[PDB]
């Protein structure tokens, strides 16, 4: 195994807004005088301490400003090694609204919005309409709509409702899924059918 190792080792790492991530860089070298160095390439570095672990970098109260690429560098015996890690800072609170608040037979459509979130790219941010856990068949998505409220986003997914039949399901469930490298979160909001 090569001399310079970082934990966690993944090339890109995720952290929640306002939360903290600590990254540990260590160098296995036989000569003393050996050292490593964290550096912020794209962003401000963060706080580095040299004792525990080996060289421990800590991002604290993470803001969107913390996202970006950082590298730890170190030489052993004349050979310089680097380890790059990219940090993603996301916002995904449990603020999921539905419109209408409750469904009345005769309602053509339903909308569900995830509030003050980021990122909002469909590969990471996805919506679903569910009934009894299963996606509601016949439901027709109209397409996401991205809006505002660091600047976060509100994202609205609208669904054309299918015939609900009898007995009408007791409720449908709007669900937002957040998928990022190493992250899968979901919030479900209820939709009472009256």
């Amino acid at each position, epitope marked *: *195994v*090569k*001399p*310079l*190792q*970082v934990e966690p*080792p993944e*090339p890109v790492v995720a952290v929640a807004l306002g939360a903290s991530r600590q990254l540990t860089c260590r160098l*296995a070298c036989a000569d003393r*005088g050996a*050292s490593v*160095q964290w*550096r912020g*390439l794209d962003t401000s570095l963060g706080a580095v301490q040299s004792d525990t672990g080996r060289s421990v970098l800590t991002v604290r109260n993470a803001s969107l400003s913390a996202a970006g690429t950082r*590298v730890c*560098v170190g*030489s052993c*015996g*004349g*050979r*310089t*090694f*680097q*380890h*790059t890690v990219q940090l993603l800072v996301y916002a995904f609170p449990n603020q999921l609204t539905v419109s209408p608040a409750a469904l009345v037979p005769g309602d053509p459509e339903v909308a569900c919005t995830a509030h003050k979130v980021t990122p909002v790219d469909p590969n990471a941010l996805s919506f679903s309409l569910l009934v009894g856990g299963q996606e509601l068949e016949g439901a027709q998505a109209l397409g996401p709509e991205v809006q505002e409220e660091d600047v976060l986003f509100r994202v609205t997914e609208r669904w054309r409702l299918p015939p609900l039949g009898t007995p009408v399901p007791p409720a449908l469930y709007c669900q937002a899924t957040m998928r990022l490298p190493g992250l899968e979160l979901s919030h479900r909001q209820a939709i009472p059918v009256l």
Partner: antibody
Amino acid sequence: QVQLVQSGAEVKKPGASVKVSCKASGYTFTSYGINWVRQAPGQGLEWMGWISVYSGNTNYAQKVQGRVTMTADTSTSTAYMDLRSLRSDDTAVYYCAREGSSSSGDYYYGMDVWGQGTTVTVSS
Amino acid sequence: DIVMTQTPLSLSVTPGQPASISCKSSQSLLHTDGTTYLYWYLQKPGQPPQLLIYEVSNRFSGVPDRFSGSGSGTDFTLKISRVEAEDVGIYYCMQNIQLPWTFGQGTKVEIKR
């Protein structure tokens, strides 16, 4: 495109001194070290010395130890080889090359990007 | 200093024919961390040196699969399944395990007509 641009050819008298520069662009200067390797006319390659950009540590080859100083300037992304007490037998093309690993530290590539070289003609 | 000896130091290759270069170090290039630090460089006429193979058998970006590096311990071989005119120049091996880094004398490759 990762690039190392060296200063122009030099003529110096025997016993003088010369400082060759190596300006870095297209990559992170501090994530790689810098080697200096020379080639005397119609001759093989020979490693001359090494500067660790991030730490300031160096290592010199026997042929230049005691009369060379190599450094790196993080303010201008430039590395220097300073060779004093010049000999006719120092006449050579001097190359600088970045030296380092893959971005994860996974593989050690060695010298994957080279400067165009600098002709140093030690002559009277 | 580790001594690197290439044999032969001159190759004349018929277009299409394979070429083989031996590189032997006076001591093993395997490190305690498991890596074997043997590297191949090519210097074409009038041009700066370029990385050809890293860690015994990994071809650098842009290096055709007709170049293949192999070996372990103190004996290594660079093979070229075919030698095109663009391949002519001087090939060097180099150890990167123990300072000072040392190169072979360089094997000169030329087309045989």
